[PDB]
Amino acid sequence: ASFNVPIIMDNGTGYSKLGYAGNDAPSYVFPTVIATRSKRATEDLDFFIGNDALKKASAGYSLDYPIRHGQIENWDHMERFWQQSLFKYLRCEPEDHYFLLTEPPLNPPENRENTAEIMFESFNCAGLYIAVQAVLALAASWTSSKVTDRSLTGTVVDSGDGVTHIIPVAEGYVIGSSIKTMPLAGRDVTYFVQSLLRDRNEPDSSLKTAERIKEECCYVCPDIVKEFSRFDREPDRYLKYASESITGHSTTIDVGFERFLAPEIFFNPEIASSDFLTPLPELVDNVVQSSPIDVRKGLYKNIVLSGGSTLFKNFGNRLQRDLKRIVDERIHRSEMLSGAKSGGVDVNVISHKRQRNAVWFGGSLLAQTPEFGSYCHTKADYEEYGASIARRYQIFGNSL
């Protein structure tokens, strides 16, 4: 492999985190959005991305998010997003560098195939590793890079903008049969905040204002009928949020029960959706109880949080208490049949200083390894087998 630093690109549904292996942060963290125009033809040169795309809606560009619900679904826009990432922001030559890419555990064979042909034929990268994204978020949880600080067994709950998935990993191996996914994350709680501002007919219900009300005003409560009652009993529970309009004037928004009812989307997904029903503490139980019996203590002892939509105030404490309730009720059913007390299991949900970008920090830490260039597809593999080299699922069991 080349001696140049690998380039790390976590392309999320909400945000892309771009940087180089071994740095103390991503070089860029900006929305996974493209601004596109809607006698020589140049409208495919005229686009913008990230923070510079958000500035272009008033100039008549159509904004789009080429990743939705965790999966790339517009390969024209994702190719233009990557070329602009590589040549504007990272300012790099693909021929000199190995790349770490990411996508959700479910992601189609078709997506890794389409990713490999853009990377090896459009850009001609030296080599590509498409990582299992929340497996990197386990490695970001270490107290330091030294081997004695590693905890190679843990459940990881990743919750970004587009999807939340719970991954069991034990001794560094991903138990792919036990992956659970909930199709609801940080964007669906924004659409719920937006919908509640809109039901009150508030002066502003733009998407940025609903987003900023999540980041600043929202938190996870114990129980929504007790918390609705606390919003009768105590008057300063309602906040006032000052927002500036697209046409440049002030507004003031009263923010109310969406402060607790919007983060409740994870703990009662029947608020968000007709199609998904199991709450996150029961969904994490289903991951560990489908997983092999000898790893269950290790998977409960280390439940790592990952992705921006896990950062709600009191989120890890609600998950820990509700999962500890599920776990001890199941252990006590067995103690009451057997007539003897167990040792129990400690359920620990872990929030940590790198939790916001744990996939990128893990990708950086794993791409720093001396062995890394041997796990990549090299362009010499792609010259023989084409994009079919990337098609086989890494995380799940394959037939053949």
Site residues for Mg ion per CB under 5 A: 12, 160
Q: Does 12 bind ligand ADP (CB under 6 A)?
A: yes
Shortest CA distance to 255 belongs to which of 266, 239, 267, 270?
239
DSSP annotation of 172 reads T
Return the residues of window 211-240 that contact ligand ADP according to CB under 6 A: 211, 214-215
Distance CA 291, CA 52 (A): 44
Residue closer to Mg ion (CB basis): 12 or 263: 12
User: Which of another protein, ligand ADP, Mg ion, none does residue 277 bind to, with CB < 5 to 8 Å depending on kind?
Assistant: another protein
Residue closer to Mg ion (CB basis): 160 or 279: 160
Distance CA 5, CA 103 (A): 21
Q: How far is the CB of 71 from Mg ion (least distance, A)?
A: 11
**Cβ neighbours of residue 366 closer than 8 Å, sequence gap 6 or more:** 100, 131, 136, 139, 372
Q: How far is the CB of 72 from ligand ADP (least distance, A)?
A: 12
Only segment of 157-165, 167-175, 248-256, 272-280 that touches ligand ADP (CB under 6 A): 157-165
Distance CA 49, CA 81 (A): 6
Return the residues of window 287-326 that contact ligand ADP according to CB under 6 A: 307-309, 311-312
Distance CA 107, CA 110 (A): 8
Q: How far is the CB of 370 from Mg ion (least distance, A)?
A: 28
Among residues 66, 127, 160, 279, the one that binds ligand ADP under rule CB under 6 A: 160
User: Which of another protein, ligand ADP, Mg ion, none does residue 214 bind to, with CB < 5 to 8 Å depending on kind?
Assistant: ligand ADP
Q: Does 363 bind ligand ADP (CB under 6 A)?
A: no
Shortest CA distance to 100 belongs to which of 387, 323, 362?
362
Q: How far is the CB of 288 from Mg ion (least distance, A)?
A: 22
Q: Does 204 bind ligand ADP (CB under 6 A)?
A: no
DSSP annotation of 6 reads P
Shortest CA distance to 166 belongs to which of 17, 265, 284?
284
Number of H helices, E strands in the chain: 13, 19
Contact set with ligand ADP (CB under 6 A):
12-15, 160-162, 186-187, 211, 214-215, 307-309, 311-312
